[PDB]
């Protein structure tokens, strides 16, 4: 039973950054040489665990997280950084025995008229603990005039939608990001 990482990375569509999903890779063998030799990958900065011995090492379990974010904000997923995409939408701890993978995806995720399906949270009263998810969409308030649920002055919708269009693509091009974290999985099993 080969691990389904090659079937989850090589997929059709993913969820937004604020509604990121997780998958539990069960007991299976996993060869990451296919991850290393893949030319389509763009950013593969792997923190913590040594890169080459990644297949050699064995851990209790591995978790796979993924989402879609702007190209210019792929840097902020790295540990020990702050911003509008890492402080609120998806926070990552100071040190984690895993690493992230990012590769460009424009044709499969952007349309000439623009895409409205992807959303990202803009307003929140406080930051998030590491590996914390929040889906609830409550009308965020300035705090002086209570909002009963009517949009207007001092009451805004917390969620906002990215706009992806064929453009310069330096930072506005949509980038797909997948996060692997290590906690019964061994690769070689010689």
């Amino acid at each position, epitope marked *: 039973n080969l691990c389904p990482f090659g079937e989850v990375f090589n997929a059709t569509r993913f969820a937004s950054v604020y509604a990121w999903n997780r998958k539990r890779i069960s007991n299976c063998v996993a060869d990451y040489s296919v991850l290393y030799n893949s030319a389509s990958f763009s950013t593969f900065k792997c923190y913590g665990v040594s890169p080459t011995k990644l297949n050699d090492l064995c851990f209790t379990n591995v978790y796979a997280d993924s989402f879609v974010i702007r190209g*210019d*904000e792929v840097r902020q997923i790295a540990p020990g950084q*702050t*911003g*509008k*995409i890492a*402080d609120y939408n998806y926070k990552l701890p100071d040190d984690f025995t895993g690493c992230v993978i990012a590769w460009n995806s424009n044709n499969l995720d952007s349309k000439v008229g*623009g895409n409205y399906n992807y959303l990202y949270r*803009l*307003f*929140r*009263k*406080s*930051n998030l603990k590491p590996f914390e998810r929040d889906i609830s969409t409550e009308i*965020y*308030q*300035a*705090g*002086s*005039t209570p909002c009963n649920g009517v949009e207007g002055f*001092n009451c*805004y*919708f917390p969620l*906002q939608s990215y*706009g992806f*269009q064929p*453009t*310069n693509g*330096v930072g*506005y091009q949509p980038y797909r990001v997948v996060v692997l974290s290590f906690e019964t999985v061994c690769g070689p099993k010689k």
Partner: single-chain antibody
Amino acid sequence: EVQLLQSAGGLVQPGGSLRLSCAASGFTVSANYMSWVRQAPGKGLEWVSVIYPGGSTFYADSVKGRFTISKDNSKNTLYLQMNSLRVEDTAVYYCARDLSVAGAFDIWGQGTLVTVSIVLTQSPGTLSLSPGEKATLFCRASQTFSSNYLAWYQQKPGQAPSLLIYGGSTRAAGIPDRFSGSGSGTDFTLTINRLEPEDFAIYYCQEYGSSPRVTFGQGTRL
């Protein structure tokens, strides 16, 4: 009615220190954003700082470490700590509330004067006209964006700027129908159907595409 107040005027020798304050009524400082924009004499507006809810903060690389920004929920004010100065820091400081995409810098302060001891450009320049004729403005961007990150500002002499257009032709409440905007691709245009006697002012373009950075154009006068 939301209104800001500032008390920072003074004269300081190089190497001195002076602090700034901004009282806010009608909106909590902790929840809403904050931003200090600096305008050198005879120069365009320049960005200094931004405060998101929580301890996150970012500065302008031009002035890093010499400026410290902090908030205070007790007095509903934010301070701009300033331990080190130089000769080129002489300017006027404006503090305003930010809303990112859903509006940009809706309400501004009154401006305080202090004295010591991607790029955007706007073409037309003077564009002098009598009240009868119609006026159109042009400012372009070196790198294209989805046009949802643009804003237009007007600044009457001796006062503080106010919002006119945000988010790609979406006007503000109370703004007359005279002002309108339309921009696509690299060239972005604002048109004014009729010129009232009071409409004579100075207009600026804005871009908030970058998350921590906002770049202000040189601006056009009328």
